[PDB]
Design a protein around this ligand. Sequence first.
Ligand SMILES: [Zn+2]
Lengths: 46, 52, 290, 492
Amino acid sequence: RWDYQPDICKDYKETGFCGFGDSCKFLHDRSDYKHGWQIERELDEG
Amino acid sequence: FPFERLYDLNHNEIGELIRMPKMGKTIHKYVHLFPKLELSVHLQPITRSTLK
Amino acid sequence: TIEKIMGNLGAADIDHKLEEQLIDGILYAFQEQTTEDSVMLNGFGTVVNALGKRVKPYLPQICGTVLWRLNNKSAKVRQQAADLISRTAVVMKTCQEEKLMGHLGVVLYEYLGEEYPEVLGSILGALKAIVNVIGMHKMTPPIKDLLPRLTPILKNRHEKVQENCIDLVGRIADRGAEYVSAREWMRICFELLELLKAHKKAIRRATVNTFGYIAKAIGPHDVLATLLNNLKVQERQNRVCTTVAIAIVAETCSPFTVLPALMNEYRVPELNVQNGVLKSLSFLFEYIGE
Amino acid sequence: WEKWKKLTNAQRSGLNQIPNRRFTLWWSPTINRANVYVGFQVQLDLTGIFMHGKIPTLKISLIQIFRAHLWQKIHESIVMDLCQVFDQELDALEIETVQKETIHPRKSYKMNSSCADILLFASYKWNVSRPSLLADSKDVMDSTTTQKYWIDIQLRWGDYDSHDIERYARAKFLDYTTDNMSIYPSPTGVLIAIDLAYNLHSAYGNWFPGSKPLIQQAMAKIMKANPALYVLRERIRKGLQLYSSEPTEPQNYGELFSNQIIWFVDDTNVYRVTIHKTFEGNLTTKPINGAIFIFNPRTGQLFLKIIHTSVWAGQKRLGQLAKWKTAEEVAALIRSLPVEEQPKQIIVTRKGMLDPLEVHLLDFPNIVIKGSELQLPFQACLKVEKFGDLILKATEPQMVLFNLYDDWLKTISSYTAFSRLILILRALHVNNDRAKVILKPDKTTITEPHHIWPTLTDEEWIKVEVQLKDLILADYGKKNNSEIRDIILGME
Ligand SMILES: [Zn+2]
């Protein structure tokens, strides 16, 4: 399969700040980057 | 790619040497334009001191 | 000696093997370093400053050394290697270090997670001294991801890291300013509002300058609204700085944009704020002049 | 290992996930092995890592290591660097053109089928062997010919249960070449496997002239130099929070201590004569016994093949016939050797003596022989008391074996024991006397009878390392009015 949704604490990523801090069970990460399907779809539509 | 075996190939296999197949036919043009001759000759003796 | 010498003279006649043993004795001195001195730093800076373009073939060597140092256990050597990067930053590029200056860019984006203020400050310094040579729109981490990473550092409550962070953000807001979104600039405004209480005055002057740059990039009106609400605080250090900042915003983006809001705020019945308005007009007439 | 502001409720409580996260990243080739009971297999997002479960701690570590398409960027840098090597050596290898296949942006992390990376266009024709491992030598570039070569780079992330990359490269080659989906534009090529978790590499494929040394060198340089790999290794170290302590980032021996054997041979002193005068004014000399020195420093092993002057009878001139003996003797050595001590490359002092043993070693023709560009003071092994008198009073030519690494392999490396050895050997070479007094400093320092050197401690060992090296430098200065490393180690 393809394991589809990475775990990107969206409060952190967008606003640099997670209310949970150390215990946020997701990945503190502000990196914008083309996904595992964005590229597939854009290229095939191209 | 010897000066001897260069027309041994056609402008497909001529360009097969240095893999420049947009230039192979011009290369063959240069080869066939370089004056190059063959010849045939017959020798028959007149006497032991002369052979024409 | 050597530093004085080549700094006065230039390195024209230094031949091949000579320059080799020199670069190598240089690397040694700098590793071997056992004191906190600008001696070996300045030596290095000068020597490559004079090698000019002679230094191309040892950039693997020089960096590899510096990076292994950047990996060390004790803070001091880590900090040293950050310094040395900030020295040779310009020649790093000028010899066209695609792999290598790219290296230093991304690898420092890595170390931005340190928690020894003494290393974090130097890392910020080295990043600033890279961005100076290589402009924004070919930076190896695009500032579009750099600055979002920098904003949570402005809360680091330490003079050296705060100094260097506000320096870097001031550069970016001055010149980059468009690889970022209005909302980002607004959050960063709200974080600047409490650098105005650092114990060091260089920080506070840098903060005011960047309020100016942000007023240039985004329009003035939202930043001015966020400044008046600060005037409402007590403890005058913040008021003095913000009132300076208001003057600066008005100077860059012409004073008719801000004068009505200031004047109208002169009507809120509180003391600290009426005096903030008056002091801000003071600075404003000083700054604009004729 | 890694020697205000006011926080909300869930900051002042709830665990800290970061030390759990790094315990899992460190122990991770075990916590994430392949031989499991029940567990349904899954590919990590943008990479070629497999999970066999759902271990969110580990998945988060691994994902954050491989962010921003680092896996493909690694594939792209490795392919570029190989290209450039071929860009350069077109000439010697007869490469007319080099073709880098414009990339499928997903070739790196699709794992059951493969495009190819490098298309190689000869000038005229290559005659090509059967496939073997990049570590196997005897290759018969005879079987076929072609102008078309393909080259493959496959990256894995191995784990404790499975990280042999020889058999990985073999299986991937055999399969992917005899399958029906991988579009190989030639019937010939090579496959190069990288193991990113263990930084291993090898290759399997059909070879032609030059390819083995060319690739071997290009691979060993990429694995060390590449910048993508460097960003990888560096995210790994920082997610572990590991630091080094050594400064300075501690030539052949990084090739040499390996699990593959390499031997060091000294035959410079197998012939020696001892000189004393007559009542006649002439200083007459008597030949004495000698010894071939065979050394494995990844073991600390010496074979001491002592030569008797039983062979001085009717052999005309000493030196070349001595070359001849050494040759046939090492040949017999390999004959008598068992299959896990068989030598692989043997380096002798005498670059002039390679030829006779060169020829003699064809009964065992796998042997990379060389002359060492760094002489090591086994001639100073004539100096010690045990070995010397052994040789001197032996009557029948014979074999002995010593482990010069007395007890060292318990608390230092073969690396460190070899380095320390070089110190000691060169110390006898240069002084022997300051050598005695440096390596037996304390009055009651002792040696256990099966030792070449005393029973020290680490403290005085580090002190005496600095001392012996101080001596080597002092004596170089006295007799002459990277450099330190290589003078310590050998020739220059
Ligand atoms: Zn969070």
